[PDB]
Ligand binder design. Sequence first.
Ligand code: NAP
Ligand code: ZST
Length: 314
Amino acid sequence: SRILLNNGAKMPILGLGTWKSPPGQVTEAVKVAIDVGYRHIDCAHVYQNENEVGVAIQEKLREQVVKREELFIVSKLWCTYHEKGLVKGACQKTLSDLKLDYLDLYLIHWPTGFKPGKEFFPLDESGNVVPSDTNILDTWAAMEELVDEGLVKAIGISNFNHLQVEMILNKPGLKYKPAVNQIECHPYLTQEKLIQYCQSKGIVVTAYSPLGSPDRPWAKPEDPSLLEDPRIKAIAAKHNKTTAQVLIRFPMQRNLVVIPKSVTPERIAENFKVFDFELSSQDMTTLLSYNRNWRVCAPLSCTSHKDYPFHEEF
Ligand SMILES: NC(=O)c1ccc[n+]([C@@H]2O[C@H](COP(=O)([O-])OP(=O)(O)OC[C@H]3O[C@@H](n4cnc5c(N)ncnc54)[C@H](OP(=O)(O)O)[C@@H]3O)[C@@H](O)[C@H]2O)c1
Ligand SMILES: O=C(O)Cc1nn(Cc2nc3cc(C(F)(F)F)ccc3s2)c(=O)c2ccccc12
């Protein structure tokens, strides 16, 4: 159920995603997730619900359902906080909201720095994202100070291409290698080259949007829909599982961590019931064959940033 990180800690391979979970419902989702066995929760300041996630963890600690040491809590440094002088503050905001004294894992959320300010997505008069003049290495160094201060046990990156990861690995005077690279990954975006790269460097990959993010706010009706793909439904039916269950078990058999999101109690329980079956060799091969290089997260508004990650092949 856990994968060994390069800081000596073990990370639960199945976690709960919290992007688009309203504060209205996320407290309940987390409480239930913890009741049915989740120990990993994936969070972010930009998700605007960390207080409410905090509320649920604190209550379950107090109910004596779980202890802190058994929980693996992940958050992410948003783009507007890449300046080295802003990083600790941003982490401590997250810590305070979550009502925690440490994070198990803190990620650079995107490789791209945006103009610091109140707005999460600063756009100019004409809709282009306004970048900041930060660079990956300076931001990484700032992430390193958080480990050395005991605020976070591990640090990592998200949405970095293999050259951006290589930049960090080759940093003269590097203090900590990234532990995790969290990237979009599912049968329509199978990431074979970037996964092979990361795992060859002892960097654990976390798969996000594993169900295709049907609730992503820019969805178009003509877009491919993983959960409704009849080819996947057919794999599911043969195993007497749901398509979500197939889609969650798929990265697990690639030695990935996976973080499906739900606020629906029934689905939170369903999604965790994936350690009682296996996908066969043909199933895995079949699912990888559905790759189309289609991304949930890849906005036109960011494509001119110097650090945009998705120009490179991988
Ligand atoms: N690092 C980054 O840049 C980044 C980017 C995107 C996502 N992430 C993380 O990855 C997590 C997962 O990705 P995601 O939120 O984009 O989407 P996802 O997990 O692929 O899909 C979530 C959608 O699927 C529905 N769903 C969940 N379980 C289901 C089931 N058993 N049957 C049918 N529908 C089900 C959910 O509905 P209900 O909730 O209404 O039940 C929701 O609409 C995020 O929440 C976030 O923590 C990180
Ligand atoms: O961030 C999440 O976890 C989910 C997420 N994704 N996206 C699509 C994005 N695509 C990006 C692309 C870059 C890029 F690096 F590529 F330029 C940088 C930043 C972003 S945000 C959003 O617009 C968003 C808005 C609010 C809360 C969460 C999200």
